[PDB]
mmCIF file with all atom_site columns, C-alpha atoms in Angstrom:
data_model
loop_
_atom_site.group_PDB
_atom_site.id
_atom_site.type_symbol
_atom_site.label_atom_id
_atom_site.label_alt_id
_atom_site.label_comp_id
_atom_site.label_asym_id
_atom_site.label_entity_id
_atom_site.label_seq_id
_atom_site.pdbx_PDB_ins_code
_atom_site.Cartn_x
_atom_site.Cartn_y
_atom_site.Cartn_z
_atom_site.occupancy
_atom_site.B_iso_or_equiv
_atom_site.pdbx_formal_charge
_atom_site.auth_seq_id
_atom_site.auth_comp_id
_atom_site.auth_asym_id
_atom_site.auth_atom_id
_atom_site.pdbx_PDB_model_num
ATOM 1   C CA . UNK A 1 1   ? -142.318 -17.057 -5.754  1.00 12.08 ? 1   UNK A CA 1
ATOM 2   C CA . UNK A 1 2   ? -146.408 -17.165 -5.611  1.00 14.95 ? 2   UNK A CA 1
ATOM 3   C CA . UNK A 1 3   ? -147.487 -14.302 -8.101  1.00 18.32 ? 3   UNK A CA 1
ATOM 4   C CA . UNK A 1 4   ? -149.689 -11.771 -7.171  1.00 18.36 ? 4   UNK A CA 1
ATOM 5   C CA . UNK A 1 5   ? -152.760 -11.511 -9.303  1.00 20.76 ? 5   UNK A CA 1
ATOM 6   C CA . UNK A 1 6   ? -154.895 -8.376  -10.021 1.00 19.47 ? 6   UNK A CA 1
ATOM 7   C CA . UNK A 1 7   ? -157.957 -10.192 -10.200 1.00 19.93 ? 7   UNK A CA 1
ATOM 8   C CA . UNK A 1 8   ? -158.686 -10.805 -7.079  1.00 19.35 ? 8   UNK A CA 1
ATOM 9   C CA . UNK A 1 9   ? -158.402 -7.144  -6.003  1.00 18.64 ? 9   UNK A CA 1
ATOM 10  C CA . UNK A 1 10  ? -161.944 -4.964  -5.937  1.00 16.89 ? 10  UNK A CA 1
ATOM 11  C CA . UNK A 1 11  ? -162.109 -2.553  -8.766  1.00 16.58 ? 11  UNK A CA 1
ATOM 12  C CA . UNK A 1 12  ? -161.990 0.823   -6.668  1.00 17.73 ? 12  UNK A CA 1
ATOM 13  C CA . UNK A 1 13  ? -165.478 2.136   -6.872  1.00 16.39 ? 13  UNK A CA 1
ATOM 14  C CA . UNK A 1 14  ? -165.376 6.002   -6.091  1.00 17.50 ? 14  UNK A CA 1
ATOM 15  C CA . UNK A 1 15  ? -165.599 8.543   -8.622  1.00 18.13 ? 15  UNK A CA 1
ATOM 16  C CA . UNK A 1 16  ? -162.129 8.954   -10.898 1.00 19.73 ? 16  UNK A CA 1
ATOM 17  C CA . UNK A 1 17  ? -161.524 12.049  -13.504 1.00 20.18 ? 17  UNK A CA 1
ATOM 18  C CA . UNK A 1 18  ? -160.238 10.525  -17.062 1.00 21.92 ? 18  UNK A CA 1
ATOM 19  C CA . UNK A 1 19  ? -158.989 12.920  -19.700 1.00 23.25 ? 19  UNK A CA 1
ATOM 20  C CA . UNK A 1 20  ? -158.713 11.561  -22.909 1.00 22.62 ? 20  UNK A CA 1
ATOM 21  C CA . UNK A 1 21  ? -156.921 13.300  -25.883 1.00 19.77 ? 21  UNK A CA 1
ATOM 22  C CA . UNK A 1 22  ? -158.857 12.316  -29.205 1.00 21.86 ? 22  UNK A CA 1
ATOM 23  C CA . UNK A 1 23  ? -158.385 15.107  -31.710 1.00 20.25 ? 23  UNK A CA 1
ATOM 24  C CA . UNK A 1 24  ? -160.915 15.009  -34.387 1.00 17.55 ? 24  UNK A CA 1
ATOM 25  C CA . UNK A 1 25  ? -161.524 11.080  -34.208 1.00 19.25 ? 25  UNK A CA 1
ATOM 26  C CA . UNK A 1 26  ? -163.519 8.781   -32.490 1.00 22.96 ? 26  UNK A CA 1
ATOM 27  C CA . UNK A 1 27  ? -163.267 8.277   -28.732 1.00 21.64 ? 27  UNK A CA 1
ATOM 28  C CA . UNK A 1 28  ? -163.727 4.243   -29.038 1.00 21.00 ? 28  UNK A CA 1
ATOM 29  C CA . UNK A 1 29  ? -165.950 3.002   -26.703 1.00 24.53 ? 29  UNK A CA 1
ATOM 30  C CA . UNK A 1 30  ? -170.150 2.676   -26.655 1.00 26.52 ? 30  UNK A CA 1
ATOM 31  C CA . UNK A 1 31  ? -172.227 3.984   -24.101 1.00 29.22 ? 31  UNK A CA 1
ATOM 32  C CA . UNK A 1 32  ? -175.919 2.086   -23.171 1.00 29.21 ? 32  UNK A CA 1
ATOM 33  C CA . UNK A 1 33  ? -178.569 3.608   -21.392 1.00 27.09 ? 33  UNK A CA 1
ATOM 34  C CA . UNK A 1 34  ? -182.260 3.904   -21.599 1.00 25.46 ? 34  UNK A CA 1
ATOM 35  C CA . UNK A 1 35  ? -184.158 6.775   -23.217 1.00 25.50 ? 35  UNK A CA 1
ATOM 36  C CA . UNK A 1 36  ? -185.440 7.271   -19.455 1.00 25.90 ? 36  UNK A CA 1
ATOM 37  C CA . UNK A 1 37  ? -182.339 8.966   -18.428 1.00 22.43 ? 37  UNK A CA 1
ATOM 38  C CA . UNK A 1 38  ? -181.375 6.054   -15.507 1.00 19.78 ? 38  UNK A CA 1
ATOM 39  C CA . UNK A 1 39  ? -177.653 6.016   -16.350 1.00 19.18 ? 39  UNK A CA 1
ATOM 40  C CA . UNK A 1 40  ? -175.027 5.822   -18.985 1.00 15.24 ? 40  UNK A CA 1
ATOM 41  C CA . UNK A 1 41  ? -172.847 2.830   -19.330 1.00 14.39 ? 41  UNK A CA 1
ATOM 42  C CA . UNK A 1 42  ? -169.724 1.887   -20.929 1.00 14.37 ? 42  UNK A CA 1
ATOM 43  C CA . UNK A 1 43  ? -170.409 -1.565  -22.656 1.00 11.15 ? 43  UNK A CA 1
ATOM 44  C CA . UNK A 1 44  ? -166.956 -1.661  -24.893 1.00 11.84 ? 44  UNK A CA 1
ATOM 45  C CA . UNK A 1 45  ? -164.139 -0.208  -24.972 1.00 11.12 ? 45  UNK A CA 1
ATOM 46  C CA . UNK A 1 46  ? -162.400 -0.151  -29.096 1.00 9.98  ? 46  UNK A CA 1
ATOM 47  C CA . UNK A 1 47  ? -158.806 -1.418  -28.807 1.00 9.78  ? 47  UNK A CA 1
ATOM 48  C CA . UNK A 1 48  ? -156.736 0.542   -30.133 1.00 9.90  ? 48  UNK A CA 1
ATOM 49  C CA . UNK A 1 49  ? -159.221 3.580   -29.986 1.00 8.92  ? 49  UNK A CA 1
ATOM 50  C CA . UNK A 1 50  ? -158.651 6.803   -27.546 1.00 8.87  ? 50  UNK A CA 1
ATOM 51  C CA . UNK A 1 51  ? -160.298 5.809   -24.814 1.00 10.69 ? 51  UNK A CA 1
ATOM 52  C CA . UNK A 1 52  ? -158.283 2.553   -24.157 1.00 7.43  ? 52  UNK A CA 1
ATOM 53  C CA . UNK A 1 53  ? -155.074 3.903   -24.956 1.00 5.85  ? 53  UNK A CA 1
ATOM 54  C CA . UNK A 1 54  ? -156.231 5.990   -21.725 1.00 4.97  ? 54  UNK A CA 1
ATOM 55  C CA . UNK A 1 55  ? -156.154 2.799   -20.039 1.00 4.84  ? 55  UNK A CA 1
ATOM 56  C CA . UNK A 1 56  ? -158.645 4.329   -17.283 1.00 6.09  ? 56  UNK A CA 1
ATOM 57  C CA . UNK A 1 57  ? -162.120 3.325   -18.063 1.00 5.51  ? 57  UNK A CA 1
ATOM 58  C CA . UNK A 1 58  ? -164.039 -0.228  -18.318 1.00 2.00  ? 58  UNK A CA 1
ATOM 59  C CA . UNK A 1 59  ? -167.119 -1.942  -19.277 1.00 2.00  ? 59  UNK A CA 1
ATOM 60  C CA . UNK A 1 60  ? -169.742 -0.677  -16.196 1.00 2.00  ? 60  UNK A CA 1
ATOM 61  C CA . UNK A 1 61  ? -168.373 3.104   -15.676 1.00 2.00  ? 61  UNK A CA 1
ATOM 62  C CA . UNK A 1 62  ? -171.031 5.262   -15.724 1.00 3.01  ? 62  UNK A CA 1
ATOM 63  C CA . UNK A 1 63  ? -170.525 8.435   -16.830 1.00 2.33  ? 63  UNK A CA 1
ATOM 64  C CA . UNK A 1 64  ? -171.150 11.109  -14.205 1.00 5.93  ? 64  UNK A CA 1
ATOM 65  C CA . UNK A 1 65  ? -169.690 13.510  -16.624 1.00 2.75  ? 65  UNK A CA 1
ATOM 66  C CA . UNK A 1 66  ? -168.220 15.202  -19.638 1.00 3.59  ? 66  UNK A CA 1
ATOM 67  C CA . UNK A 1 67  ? -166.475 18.384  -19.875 1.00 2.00  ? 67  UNK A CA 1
ATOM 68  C CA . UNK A 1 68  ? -168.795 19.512  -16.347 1.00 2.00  ? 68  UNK A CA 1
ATOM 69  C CA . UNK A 1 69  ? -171.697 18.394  -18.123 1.00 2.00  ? 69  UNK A CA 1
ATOM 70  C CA . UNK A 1 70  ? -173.977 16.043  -15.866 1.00 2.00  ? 70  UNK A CA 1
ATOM 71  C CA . UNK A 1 71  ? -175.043 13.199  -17.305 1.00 2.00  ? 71  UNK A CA 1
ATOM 72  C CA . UNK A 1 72  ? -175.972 11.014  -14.816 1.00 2.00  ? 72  UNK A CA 1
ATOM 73  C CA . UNK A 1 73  ? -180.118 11.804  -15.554 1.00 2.00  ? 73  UNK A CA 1
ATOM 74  C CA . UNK A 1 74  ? -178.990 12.012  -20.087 1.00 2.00  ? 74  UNK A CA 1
ATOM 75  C CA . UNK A 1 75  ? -180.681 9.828   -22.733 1.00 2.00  ? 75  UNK A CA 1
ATOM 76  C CA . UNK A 1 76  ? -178.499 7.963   -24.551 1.00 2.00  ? 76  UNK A CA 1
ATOM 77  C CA . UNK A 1 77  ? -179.029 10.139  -27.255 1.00 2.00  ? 77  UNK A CA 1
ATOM 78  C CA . UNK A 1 78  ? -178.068 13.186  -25.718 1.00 2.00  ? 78  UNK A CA 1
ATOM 79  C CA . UNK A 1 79  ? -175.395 11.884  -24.277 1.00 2.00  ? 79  UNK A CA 1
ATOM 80  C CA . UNK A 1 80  ? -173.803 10.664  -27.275 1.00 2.00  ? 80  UNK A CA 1
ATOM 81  C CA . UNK A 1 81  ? -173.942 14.210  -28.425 1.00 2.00  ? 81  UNK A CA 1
ATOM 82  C CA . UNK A 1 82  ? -172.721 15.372  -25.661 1.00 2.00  ? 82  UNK A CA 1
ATOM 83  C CA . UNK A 1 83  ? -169.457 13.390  -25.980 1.00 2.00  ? 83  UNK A CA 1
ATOM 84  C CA . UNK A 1 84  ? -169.500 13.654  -29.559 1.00 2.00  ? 84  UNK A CA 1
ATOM 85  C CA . UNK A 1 85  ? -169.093 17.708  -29.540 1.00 2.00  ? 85  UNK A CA 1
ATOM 86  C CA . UNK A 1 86  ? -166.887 17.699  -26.328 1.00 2.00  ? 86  UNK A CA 1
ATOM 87  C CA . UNK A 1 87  ? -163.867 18.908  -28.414 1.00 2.00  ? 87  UNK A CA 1
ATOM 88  C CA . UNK A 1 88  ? -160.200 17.024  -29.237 1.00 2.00  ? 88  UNK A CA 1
ATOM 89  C CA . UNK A 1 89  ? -159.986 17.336  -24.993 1.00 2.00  ? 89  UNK A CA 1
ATOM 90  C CA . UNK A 1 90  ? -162.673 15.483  -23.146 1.00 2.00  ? 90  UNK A CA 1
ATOM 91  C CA . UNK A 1 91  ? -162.584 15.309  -19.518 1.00 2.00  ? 91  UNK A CA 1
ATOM 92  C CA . UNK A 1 92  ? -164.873 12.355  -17.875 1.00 2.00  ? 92  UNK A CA 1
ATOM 93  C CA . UNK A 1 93  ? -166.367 11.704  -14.239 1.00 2.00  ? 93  UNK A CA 1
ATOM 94  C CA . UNK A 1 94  ? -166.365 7.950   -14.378 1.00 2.00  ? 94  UNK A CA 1
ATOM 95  C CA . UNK A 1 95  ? -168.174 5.632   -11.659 1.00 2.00  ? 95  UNK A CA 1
ATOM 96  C CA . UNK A 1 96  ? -167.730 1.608   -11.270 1.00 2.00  ? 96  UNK A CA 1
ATOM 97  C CA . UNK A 1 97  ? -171.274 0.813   -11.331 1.00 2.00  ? 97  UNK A CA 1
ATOM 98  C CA . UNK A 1 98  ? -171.495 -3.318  -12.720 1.00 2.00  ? 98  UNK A CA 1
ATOM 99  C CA . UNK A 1 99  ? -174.675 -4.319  -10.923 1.00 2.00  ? 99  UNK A CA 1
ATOM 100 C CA . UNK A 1 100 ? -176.753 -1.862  -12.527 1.00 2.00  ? 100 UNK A CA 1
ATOM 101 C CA . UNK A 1 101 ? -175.008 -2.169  -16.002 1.00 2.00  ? 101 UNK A CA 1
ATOM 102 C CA . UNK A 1 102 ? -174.988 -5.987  -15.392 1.00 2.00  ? 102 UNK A CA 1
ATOM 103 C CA . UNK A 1 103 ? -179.137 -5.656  -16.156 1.00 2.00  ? 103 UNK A CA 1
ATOM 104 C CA . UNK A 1 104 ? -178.221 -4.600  -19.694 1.00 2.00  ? 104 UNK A CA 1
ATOM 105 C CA . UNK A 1 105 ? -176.072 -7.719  -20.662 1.00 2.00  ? 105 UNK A CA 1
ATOM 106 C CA . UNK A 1 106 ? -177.640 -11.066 -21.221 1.00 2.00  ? 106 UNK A CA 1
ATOM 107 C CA . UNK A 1 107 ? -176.701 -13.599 -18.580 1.00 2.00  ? 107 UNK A CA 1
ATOM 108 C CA . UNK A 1 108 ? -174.205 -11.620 -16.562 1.00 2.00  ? 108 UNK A CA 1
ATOM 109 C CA . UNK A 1 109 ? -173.803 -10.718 -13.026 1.00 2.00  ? 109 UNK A CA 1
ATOM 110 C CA . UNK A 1 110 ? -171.034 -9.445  -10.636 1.00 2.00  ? 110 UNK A CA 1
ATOM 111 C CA . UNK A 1 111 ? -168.909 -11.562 -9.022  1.00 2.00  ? 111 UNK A CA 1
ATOM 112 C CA . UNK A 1 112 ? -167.335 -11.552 -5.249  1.00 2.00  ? 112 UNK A CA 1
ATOM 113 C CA . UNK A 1 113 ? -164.419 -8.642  -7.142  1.00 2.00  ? 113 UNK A CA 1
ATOM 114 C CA . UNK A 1 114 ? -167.234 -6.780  -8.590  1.00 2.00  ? 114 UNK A CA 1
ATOM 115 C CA . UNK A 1 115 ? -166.443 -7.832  -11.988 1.00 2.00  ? 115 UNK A CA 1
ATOM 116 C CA . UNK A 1 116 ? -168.819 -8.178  -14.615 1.00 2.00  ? 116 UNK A CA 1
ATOM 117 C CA . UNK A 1 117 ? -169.135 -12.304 -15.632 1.00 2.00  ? 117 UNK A CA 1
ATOM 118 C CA . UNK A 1 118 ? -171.423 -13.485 -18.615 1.00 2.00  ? 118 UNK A CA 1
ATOM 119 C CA . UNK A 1 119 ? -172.198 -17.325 -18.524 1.00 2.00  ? 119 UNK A CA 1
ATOM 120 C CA . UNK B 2 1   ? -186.716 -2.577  -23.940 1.00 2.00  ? 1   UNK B CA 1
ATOM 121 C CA . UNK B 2 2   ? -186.207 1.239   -23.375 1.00 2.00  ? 2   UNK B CA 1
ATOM 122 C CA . UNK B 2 3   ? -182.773 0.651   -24.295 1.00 2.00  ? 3   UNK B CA 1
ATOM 123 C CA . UNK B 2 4   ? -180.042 2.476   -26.604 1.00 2.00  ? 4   UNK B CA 1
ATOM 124 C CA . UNK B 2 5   ? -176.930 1.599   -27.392 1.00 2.00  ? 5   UNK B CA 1
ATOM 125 C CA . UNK B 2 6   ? -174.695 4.181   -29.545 1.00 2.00  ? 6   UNK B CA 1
ATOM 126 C CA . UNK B 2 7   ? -170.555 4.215   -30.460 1.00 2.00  ? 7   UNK B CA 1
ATOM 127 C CA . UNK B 2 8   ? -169.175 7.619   -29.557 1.00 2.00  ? 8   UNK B CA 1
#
């Protein structure tokens, strides 16, 4: 009965819509970008926290989005304002993007999936 | 590094 293993199967790449209910806490993950506005990246995602008990979002989404908000040209700083003050609802474009977070991340690269490896 | 890494 030769199981069937997720990990083989390419993380789906398009654009997805996550809605995460936080209330007045913490949505537990950290974003990484650049103050030059080239993208914001999930690096970690809290267990436990809001935005895993989603269950939709990984290390490498970018966020397109929050609450209709673009952020796909933000600072990080902005951005974590942005999602900060998005209220107890807060409604994210996320996009698979690990080769371009991969250049954050010491010794790490994308493999034939497109998931993120660190050696 | 440019870079900026924050917990939200």
């Amino acid at each position: 009965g030769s199981p069937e293993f997720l990990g083989e199967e390419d993380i789906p790449r398009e654009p997805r819509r996550i809605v995460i209910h936080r209330g007045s806490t913490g949505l537990g993950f950290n974003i990484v970008g650049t103050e030059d506005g080239e993208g914001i990246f999930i690096s970690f995602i809290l267990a436990g926290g809001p935005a895993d008990l989603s269950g939709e979002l990984r290390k490498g989404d970018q966020i397109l989005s929050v609450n209709g908000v673009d952020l796909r040209n933000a600072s990080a700083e902005q951005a974590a304002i942005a999602l900060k003050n998005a209220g107890q609802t807060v409604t994210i474009i996320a996009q698979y993007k690990p080769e371009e977070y991969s250049r954050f991340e010491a010794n790490s690269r994308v493999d034939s999936s497109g998931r993120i490896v660190t050696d | 590094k440019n870079y900026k890494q924050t917990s939200v």
